[PDB]
Amino acid sequence: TRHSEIIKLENSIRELHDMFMDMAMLVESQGEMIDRIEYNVEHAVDYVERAVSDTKKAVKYQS
Amino acid sequence: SKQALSEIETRHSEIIKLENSIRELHDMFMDMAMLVESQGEMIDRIEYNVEHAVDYVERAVSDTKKAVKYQS
Amino acid sequence: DAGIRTLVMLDEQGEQLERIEEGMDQINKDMKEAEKNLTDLGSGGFIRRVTNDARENEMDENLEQVSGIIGNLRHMALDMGNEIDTQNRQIDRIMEKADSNKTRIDEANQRATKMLG
Amino acid sequence: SADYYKGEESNSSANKCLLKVAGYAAQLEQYQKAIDIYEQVGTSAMDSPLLKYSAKDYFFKAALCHFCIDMLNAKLAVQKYEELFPAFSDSRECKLMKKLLEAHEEQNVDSYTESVKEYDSISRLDQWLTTMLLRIKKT
Amino acid sequence: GMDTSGKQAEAMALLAEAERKVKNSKIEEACEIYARAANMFKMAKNWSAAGNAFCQAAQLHLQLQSKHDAATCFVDAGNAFKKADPQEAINCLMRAIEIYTDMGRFTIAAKHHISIAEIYETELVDVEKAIAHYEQSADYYKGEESNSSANKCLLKVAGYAAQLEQYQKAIDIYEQVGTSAMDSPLLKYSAKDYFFKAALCHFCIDMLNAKLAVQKYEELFPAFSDSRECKLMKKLLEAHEEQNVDSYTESVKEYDSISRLDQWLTTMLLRIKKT
Amino acid sequence: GMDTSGKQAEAMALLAEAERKVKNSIEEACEIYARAANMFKMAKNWSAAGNAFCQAAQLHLQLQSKHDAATCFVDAGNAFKKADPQEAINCLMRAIEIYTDMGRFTIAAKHHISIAEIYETELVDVEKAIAHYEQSADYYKGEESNSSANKCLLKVAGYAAQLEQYQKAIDIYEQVGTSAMDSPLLKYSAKDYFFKAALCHFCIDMLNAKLAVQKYEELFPAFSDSRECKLMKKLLEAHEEQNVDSYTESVKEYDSISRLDQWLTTMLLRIKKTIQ
Amino acid sequence: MAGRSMQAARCPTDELSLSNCAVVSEKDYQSGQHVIVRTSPNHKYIFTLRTHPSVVPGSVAFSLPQRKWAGLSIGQEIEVALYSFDKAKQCIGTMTIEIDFLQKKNIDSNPYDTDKMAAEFIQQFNNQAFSVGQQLVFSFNDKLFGLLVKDIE
User: Fold this and answer.
1) In whole angstroms, what is the distance from residue A51 CA to residue C108 CA?
2) β-sheet bridge partners, residue G5
């Protein structure tokens, strides 16, 4: 009985360790991706703001 | 008896290893909670930025619609 | 408790991610329409009574609880893990959408700049 | 803020807002609002697998809030809470409050104090939970 | 099953109408309707001809003054060919990668490289070419500092090298990855597996220097002793030092009793034990 | 491979074209320089790409552009990261200055963290790394990013304790522990911070460490139940009598029951150095 | 002179194994030369070379007692550097050695003339390297003895 419970616990701990390492790698990758997307969207919003401001000023000057 | 207590110590030998493994898992849980919290706050910040962007985009679309309607 | 808090936070993050994806889709549709209009403008046992074993009962209960807790945490961890893969796939999809949207606005700006000259 | 969030169709935040509101309100000795909000949050989270297990804590909080009303309906409330969520029996909270009620039935403060000390030793308690426990002791 | 026939008929009718319109400024409309026809044919589930039509529409778009649309059409055509003649998908994805690197997009180019390597190794038998693609993707990610993708590529190439008997490359990659993980505050525990893998790679070369390798792994990372991998390693060493068959058999049975061994690990262990 | 030679030749041709275009005199020159530097980077010759990127950034800024120039400068610094850290550092400082001028706190903090990482990994400097980490922590605290600021402060305190006097380390550890005490999830780790503080206090003086651990026990009731508090008490009692053997026995027992971070051992040895 | 890489090999002849001499190939070195075998930074063993035609070139052959003393392994990689003894300081005056039978099957109590033992030891091991604590096998009266060097003068 001792061997059965001990081996069951060891297998459960190993499985938990494996899945936790898997989600740790996935979370690190996702954090890198989200860090990238913050900068990307910031640059995109700045660029579109610049372009629309240019459009508005040009149309106002021309009319 | 000497043999019986030697066997009892042998049985106890595995308790320390199990305790170390469980404390390892507890530390992993504590670390993962911190990473989840950091991701949550960063996602909230990104969502705030997206709300600002969409509000400005809607305002610009309204202005463009007004301009085309009046000019046309 | 740490497990539970992680689960709830993951739920909230997933909902927020869905919200941002919807926002990006709306952005894309509206900007496309605006550009087009502008162009148109132109069983076992954990006990062993060998020598009384009066100091082995409490260990069993702790072990029992730990084994049960680990069993539940196994399923719990699986459930919490399931969400992250879907979240990552959604993140990749928004990656593509944001890149496409950025390129569209850039090309629109280029066309706007080139139309005058 | 919660009303605005509901009007914006943005879920997963109204529940936490109501939970915090109930936790704050229970400080000022207003139980009906706290009971209603806690039961609403519990029934909302019961069907969600992610928060279903955590719903037990909400039920325990509601039971603690309902405990001060009167022991007669508190037992019934606990029984009712156990009836709707039979898995609630797995949580040690059910046995904890059962022992506390057994001790209180004959003004035996020693047993309740021992139970609270054991619960604190095994796991730390929250300030609000400790305050409610001391208030129950004052009875 | 009338649905498949109906979808085929609709897609071919749309393609014929697109051909008529383009035959009759016109380039933009022709390309748009051709893309719609390709999408309809893809929905029709005729994978080979759908991919052919989609790639033809992509080429017609290339004829038009446009780049990002061209590259998107190329990648979609490659995905369509994924379930067709792999060579056409490979060529289309190669051209898409060339265009992307022409514009400096490292991430999508490396993703496409990994995709072509994966399709080559899963469907075809030539994995060595996929090794070159994986190495190129890893170098690109290292240039972009994409730690996760570069680490995954390095691990995959090291595993394939170990499978192909390239022991030294696999051992070097595993040692580098383990050292990198150990230096960082996190991932240091997984370094044990890399050391175990690296030690297997070394042990297959010889048994005399296995003692030196295990000594290096132990002293460099004393905590590695607690890992059952080191216990199994020393047990294998003492078993193989003498011509006794029962020792390694009971060792492998004891280790397998806990958790099942993977295919690569099982075959590597059987190979080392046999020789 | 022919790829490297082809990219090198294309970069040279594009550099010549851009130089001729500017000599005649404008965005076409900047685009040509950027493309040439991209091909240079493709060729794996990390050196000499930064010069082209800097020229492109200067040409772009010549027409008042600040965003594209800043991004190009950041890319040039990344390219110089391993080619020449001196120029990568200069480009990163320039980017930080520009982003501060336009008020981008998040980007400035990120650049401050990157510079600190490069200083700690490539060059040999801790004071500069500590200053950069503190600046990034202040910026992120301004940006309500308490987690990263606290992490940076903890790293700075650890560096100071390892090399500098312990007053800053003691203050940072105590503040972080007090803040965590209120935080539900991270209240438990406050014990480790208080453990470090007590151990660091041990170095300053025995009676001071005793008073500090007593105060920590009084403030945090469960600290009395913690094994670290018992170990500190037992160790202080043994060191009061100048008994090295008991100190070593306790250290060995604590290491056996649980492993060490590889820094607690260093601090224990340093404490034992003055035991006499 | 600076040292060359070599592969440890099996002793070619049992007679040379009894002589306890480091056996090498003709192309590797010359008979009688003194070498130092570096197995690790802290493991340098001084041996005397005894070339034999049967030794494959590029390999250094060792006997079982040599492997025991130095912990060598058949096929092990080592370094070998030529060395010359300082007879002005390193000449051996006296050798107090302890002797324990290598084989327990034929242990005997027969008397042995220690004078003849010393004479044969000198004759077989003349101009050969010996260090304190060294282990070897010595054949006397056709009987094998496990000699463990204890003291030298």
Assistant:
1) 9
2) G79
| Cross-sheet strand order for the sheet of G77-83 | G23-24, G59-62, G4-10, G77-83, G34-40, G43-48
Other C-beta atoms within 10 Å of F205: how many?
11
Q: Which two tokens stand for residue E134?
A: 């994986």
The chain C residue lying nearest B7, using CA atoms, is: C50
Tokens (6 digits) for D81: 């809470």
User: What residues contact residue C44 under an 8 Å CB cut-off, 6+ apart?
Assistant: A1, A4, A5
- Where residue D29 falls (left for φ over 0; alpha for ψ -120 to 50; beta otherwise) is left
Distance from CA of B5 to the nearest CA of C (A): 10
Instruction: Give D20-26 contacts, CB < 8 A, sequence gap 24+.
Output: D22/D61, D23/D61, D23/D128, D26/D65, D26/D128, D26/D132
E158: distance to nearest CA of chain B, Å? Answer: 28
Asked if A24 lies within 8 A of E186 by C-beta distance, the reply is yes
Of D20, D112, D96, D97, nearest to D58 by C-alpha is D20
Cβ neighbours of A38 in F, within 8 Å = 106
Range 38-57 of B in CB contact (< 8 A) with C:
39-40, 43-44, 46-47, 50-51, 53-54, 57
Number of H helices and E strands in chain C, helices first, is: 2, 0
The answer to whether E216 and E199 have CB atoms below 8 angstroms apart is no
Angle at D133 between CA D128 and CA D136, to 5 degrees: 125
Per CB-CB distance under 8 Å, the chain B contacts of C34 are: 60-61, 64-65
Q: Cβ contact (<8 Å) for A50 and F71?
A: no
Buried b (16+ CB within 10 A) or exposed e, D94-107: beebebbeebbeee
SS3 at position F123: coil
Beta-carbon contacts of E107 under 8 Å, excluding residues fewer than 6 positions away, are E144, E146
Instruction: With beta carbons less than 8 A apart as the criterion, state whether E20 and E14 touch.
Output: no
* Residues of chain A contacting residue C46, judged by C-beta atoms under 8 Å apart: 1-2, 5
Q: Give E144→chain F minimum CA distance, Å.
A: 9
CA distance C108 to A50: 13
Residue F127 φ/ψ, nearest 5 degrees:
-60, -45
